[model samples]
Target: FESLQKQEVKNLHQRLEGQRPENKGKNRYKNILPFDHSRVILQGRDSNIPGSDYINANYIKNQLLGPDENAKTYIASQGCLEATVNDFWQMAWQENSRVIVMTTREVEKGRNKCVPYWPEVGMQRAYGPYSVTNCGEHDTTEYKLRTLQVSPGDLIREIWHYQYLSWPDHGVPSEPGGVLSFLDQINQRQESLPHAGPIIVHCSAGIGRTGTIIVIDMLMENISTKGLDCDIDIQKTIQMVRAQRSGMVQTEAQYKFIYVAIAQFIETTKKKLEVLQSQK
Candidate 1:
């Protein structure tokens, strides 16, 4: 495993070095943080929202491609700024996103990580052409779940907001179990929903925590289906995601966390399966 990890790290470094310099095109206004790079060009033939000229949003379309090609899986984005909150909702509506995975808090350690993008309970607010209402909320030890109603003129859609509250800024949780469980809940719900769109995931920078969560989910999918043959290249997966969005899996700590989390998950699942078989 150590040898494998070393090789993977080297591979990832090569990919990073090969990437082109970040381009500041018409999307200069769409970024909240200057250092954060843009993944999807807001204005182009391949624009996520075609025919729309709206700028000032840090949202980008992230397609999950692979052996089977799950394209409608994610829209990784940065935390909302006061100036870009409306564009955030507009993008959500345009993409038909029903699941929003927020990995950071509104404020972290005296710094503003994300602005309050959604409405409070029993309250509704207008964002551009959409009227958003907070219908309900369920708080847990690791995360908070909110039921939101979004309406554009006449059509309405209900969406779920899963906010993992314990993740620290530019850091990871002490254990991966809680995050794994949270992912299970989100994944289960995602499978149950018919015609569900991409899950909107975001953190402060939309690359560290956001990338970590996405990387784990994609790896888990492979592990579950391919079993021991799941020779998933972690570095390659990060590279693909980074190809879509720059600076994904931001820090070395975050990149290492993905390996640790996957190892723990595999061990725990194996133990559980052993226990069940022994009972039989």
Candidate 2:
């Protein structure tokens, strides 16, 4: 891997750094979920659950480590589950305090547990073995967990993460709408909730689609509110994002393509916004 291009490595670092900015220059989301703005610790899971299509664990172990652990060690898979959006939140909640996904089930499993949305074909299908009907397989349901104002301490937190862009692969054409929907959800959460800082996001390895979507969302927000001429450095921004959510930029293409995609996405959303204005 060291023999690869330098720009490739830079792309990876840019994405990592964007995700975990406080780590100085390290990934901090390996075996642990971010507990609060200040600290992190392990959330035990013996092995990766079946049916959830996720990346290899070695990718994560390589990305995050304590000062003592073999930071370069490899592991098998990242963990995920389907048909249990609420269950997943409850599980994470136990380890921490109260965590909620800032998203609805991609398939709304409570209704069928197995609804399929094909990314390659850009269409929805019935729940089946390959659909969101089962406990696993192509499920991306996220939540917006919030802590009450009277909680004991900062341990009670609010996080907004979505499980929207995972299944048919991250940042696939079929998944952008879902991701945009999640963005709207976050906007709603921010407007409704009290906490007004950075929100957390995660997935199995935190690369590929995760990195792509985060970059897109950040870019979109920058354009929507800050104006399109802001002098933001996309490369620097992505580096920080990856630091928190390791493997956020899976491939060089995702890293490069994301910038182009965001520029284009900005125009597209703008045109839609104009149309709505005209109608009104």
Candidate 3:
């Protein structure tokens, strides 16, 4: 988290600089995050935390407030490490969507960063609340528990995954679930938000986790829904995100590394399905 000491960012940056030879576009510093779109606001990284832990409240507030004023907000989180569920609750009160569905690592209830604030803000305001799961003891496997279904009348569904904090290597698999969940939820709700709108997404830094999720979601959409079998080029996708949002993946290779990770998920799912069919 940005809550780490100031010297931390500087130290890491300097150390990373020295390791520059390996830090090229080929170096997939997996944690390097990139922002996907303008609506997909970013936070925490820039704040540097000087001395307080509150973490740029303004940045967080702006994340909830800045997007087109009319757009609905969606918050996706894993384990509530950097993002608080309160982020959604506040958005619910201020930027009310037809409904705001939160996907979390903590299923029914657990001490996450945002729990206190969720109940604190009268339930009346955060009424349309629903979590597509119950917590799982294993961080990486927790996402399989419950999936979110999009509901009718929903104009927008914002998806956020706090990938920065999940158990190492868990982010890649968790992401497609966002797309699958979005598709399933939207279908279950029997609705679709217009194609033109961007689905807001952010991890603390916004580059690594956020960029990976956006690209994979789009790739999955293109292949599965569009039935277009074009192979997804991760580098090209990262470039597109960088063109739109300045700081996507910290390292060039980190951007591409994610695609490799996601590919495993995709292929694994394919094999699992094939095996199940073979058994049948």
Question: Which of the numbered candidates is closest to the native, going by highest lDDT?
Answer: 1
Q: How much is 53 displaced in model 2, in angstroms?
A: 26
lDDT of 3 by residue, 35-76 (tens): 222222222222442321111111111122233443322222
> Worst 10-residue stretch by lDDT in candidate 3?
53-62
TM-score of 2: 0.43
lDDT of 2 by residue, 5-120 (tens): 56643333222211443332123234433222212222333245332221221222223334332321111112232332322332233233221222223333233222222222
| Candidate 2, position 9, lDDT | 38
Identify the candidate with maximal TM-score. 1
Ranking by lDDT: 1, 2, 3
Candidate 2 Cα RMSD after full superposition onto the native fold (Å): 14.2
lDDT of 1 by residue, 180-276 (tens): 9888898888877867777888886577898788888878877877783468688988877776565768888889889988998888777777546
The lDDT for every candidate, in the order shown, is: 0.70, 0.40, 0.35
Clash count of each predicted structure:
0, 39, 18
The predicted structure with the larger lDDT, 2 or 3, is: 2
